Design a protein around this ligand. Structure first.
Ligand SMILES: [Zn+2]
Ligand SMILES: [Zn+2]
Lengths: 138, 137
């Protein structure tokens, strides 16, 4: 078997992350198809259909039965390298594989960074408003 | 950033295991050379030059400066699959790699087994002698 950190590169693992996925036989966005497109299922109490690309970290919910996950991935995250990987996992060279895993580690940092920015800016607006209000109480 | 279990497949890791190795520049069995041939350094108080193939688990000590580790590996463990791997690590496919790692896992078991056999036979010798000594009476 393989290290936990790398399991998501495996289609079978990705599929196994969907336990109560609602869209099964009859639907375009099945687990096989969500997984082939790179998604993991990471449902919340608030969004029980939330999926994430394991590679670029894009999150999507609001899935409908006729939705094609490849098309949707390609719409919301056109830059994602995974969409270029033509080869099956075992046909990859370790060099190719390690190269992918560095891009994924960069994409993860970028996601954490872009989050911290947003939270920072929300905080900064509160503090600015609070000080503005006090200068005004005048 | 690779899993501890798999590091020994990397030449630079293998070299790093040689800290107190006596045969350095000028010698045929340097760390670069020991490492290229598959060896890790696993010295004991009793055998400070003990080296082991990471892949087939063969152990060798009694190293001399003109010794070529590939030639020694071939001589004592001719069956070892690692001696066939012509490609650099990164040029391997994951399939090829996973295939190698299963063979290594089998080799390890076989060695644990060949150890347990030897310990068993040593214990049996002791018991035999003990019964012999008493029966002399
Ligand atoms: Zn993606
Ligand atoms: Zn060997």
């Amino acid at each position: 078997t393989l290290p936990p950190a790398w399991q998501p590169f495996l289609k079978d693992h990705r599929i196994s992350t969907f336990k109560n996925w609602p869209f099964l036989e009859g639907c375009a966005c099945t687990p096989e198809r969500m997984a082939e497109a790179g998604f993991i299922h990471c449902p919340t109490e608030n969004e029980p259909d939330l999926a994430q690309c394991f590679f670029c970290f894009k999150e999507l919910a609001g899935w409908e039965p006729d939705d094609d996950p490849i098309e949707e991935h390609k719409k919301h995250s056109s830059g994602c390298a995974f969409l270029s990987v033509k080869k099956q996992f075992e046909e990859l060279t370790l060099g190719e594989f390690l190269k992918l895993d560095r891009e994924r580690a960069k994409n993860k940092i970028a996601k954490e960074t872009n989050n911290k920015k947003k939270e920072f800016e929300e905080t900064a607006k509160k503090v600015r408003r609070a000080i503005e209000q006090l200068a005004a109480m005048d």
